[PDB]
Amino acid sequence: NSIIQRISKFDNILKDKTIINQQDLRQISWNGIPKIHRPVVWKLLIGYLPVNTKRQEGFLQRKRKEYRDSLKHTFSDQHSRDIPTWHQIEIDIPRTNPHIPLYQFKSVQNSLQRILYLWAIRHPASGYVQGINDLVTPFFETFLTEYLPPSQIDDVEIKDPSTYMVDEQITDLEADTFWCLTKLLEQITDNYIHGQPGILRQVKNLSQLVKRIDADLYNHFQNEHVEFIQFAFRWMNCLLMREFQMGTVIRMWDTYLSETSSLNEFHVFVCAAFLIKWSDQLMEMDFQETITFLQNPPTKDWTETDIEMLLSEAFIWQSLYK
């Protein structure tokens, strides 16, 4: 399974086939998608780009035009709680992914501002919710790589998009990111409506799962008064993004998108397997040590092997439970 060979396998699935076979694509993508293919494959797996290649050009033109029109319509046109929401998002943008240079560029901040604003305006039941600013980034960053030479994809996090893309392309990127973010969130809608009932349910599900497979760890938490919400809310709210390096998050998403192409369900098992990995270590920690540890897991040097192992385990656990 050489890197070059793998790229070729995806090429024959994606090119010169007229109608792309979703089944074949999901099967191979589960084990990781070559970076050069992520933009296209992610859009196909999430249900944005149509599998019939003959319908893609028109589809994109219409979707990208719709994004533009919607944004134009939502600007100084109506008289709603618009402005306030815009400022609420303005407060979080500059503070998103402070450890990654890409996110401090003004072009990036303005692009994310528009994307999140439009989604927020289109979802009154949720409005803008902290956490969505994190979820939009893996899509934004991955889709951005399609505009760079393949040999420079590894530098997407340090280059200003306005230095290699014209305004029209940045808007196209914004549209694709927006529609894909929309498709993602539609699978976990109640995770973000007021009161975030979906997240509370997820945390309860994780709590019950752990009580099931590791009663000793569960009992230790009780004795040390460790509540799952104290560390798992963030795990659920940002889909574990705040617990891993972006490269690891991107790789994880290849599998999440392939597996759900059931998001909440699969995520709960990944969280359980992640937690259980630290079980022995956690058994020797008190409240403060535990919270500090779970909000700052030692995943800095995780490799493809580490991530692949976690996902594979979560898949087996989920399969057994069903």
Q: Are 263 and 311 in contact (CB under 8 A)?
A: no
Q: What angle do CA 179, 185, 187 make, to 5 degrees?
A: 115
Q: Are 138 and 250 in contact (CB under 8 A)?
A: yes
| Residue 35 CB coordination number (10 Å) | 18
DSSP string, 119-151: HHHH-TTT-S-TTHHHHHHHHHHHHHGGGS-GG
As a whole number of angstroms, the distance between CA 260 and CA 183 comes to 12
* C-alpha distances in Å from residue 10, one per residue of 38, 49, 62, 212, 295: 10, 16, 27, 40, 37
Phi, psi of 315 (to 5 degrees): -65, -45
Name the amino acid, one letter, at 300.
K
Ramachandran area for residue 52 (φ above 0: left; ψ -120 to 50: alpha; else beta) = beta
Phi, psi of 12 (to 5 degrees): -70, -20
Q: Are 7 and 41 in contact (CB under 8 A)?
A: no
* C-alpha distances in Å from residue 110, one per residue of 46, 80, 90, 266, 268: 25, 21, 9, 33, 33
Ramachandran area for residue 18 (φ above 0: left; ψ -120 to 50: alpha; else beta) = left
Task: Read off the tokens for 103.
Answer: 């996110």
How was it solved? X-ray
As a whole number of angstroms, the distance between CA 266 and CA 272 comes to 10
* Resolution number, Å: 1.9
Name the amino acid, one letter, at 204.
K
Q: Are 279 and 290 in contact (CB under 8 A)?
A: no
* C-alpha distances in Å from residue 197, one per residue of 10, 143, 147: 39, 31, 38
As a whole number of angstroms, the distance between CA 174 and CA 170 comes to 6
Q: Are 10 and 254 in contact (CB under 8 A)?
A: no
Q: What angle do CA 312, 186, 117 make, to 5 degrees?
A: 120
Q: Which of 238, 232, 199, 180 is nearest to 49 (CA)?
A: 180
As a whole number of angstroms, the distance between CA 134 and CA 112 comes to 10
Q: Is 156 helix (H, G, I), strand (E, B) or coil?
A: coil
Residues 6+ apart with CB under 8 A from 170: 107, 111, 161, 162
DSSP string, 295-310: TS-S-TT--HHHHHHH
DSSP class of residue 189 equals G
Task: Read off the tokens for 38.
Answer: 């992520």
The domain segmentation of the chain, as residue ranges, is 1-194, 195-322
Bridge partners (DSSP) of residue 19 are: 52
Q: Tell me which CATH code domain 195-322 carries.
A: 1.10.472.80
CA-CA-CA-CA torsion for 121, 124, 127, 131, nearest 10 degrees?
-100
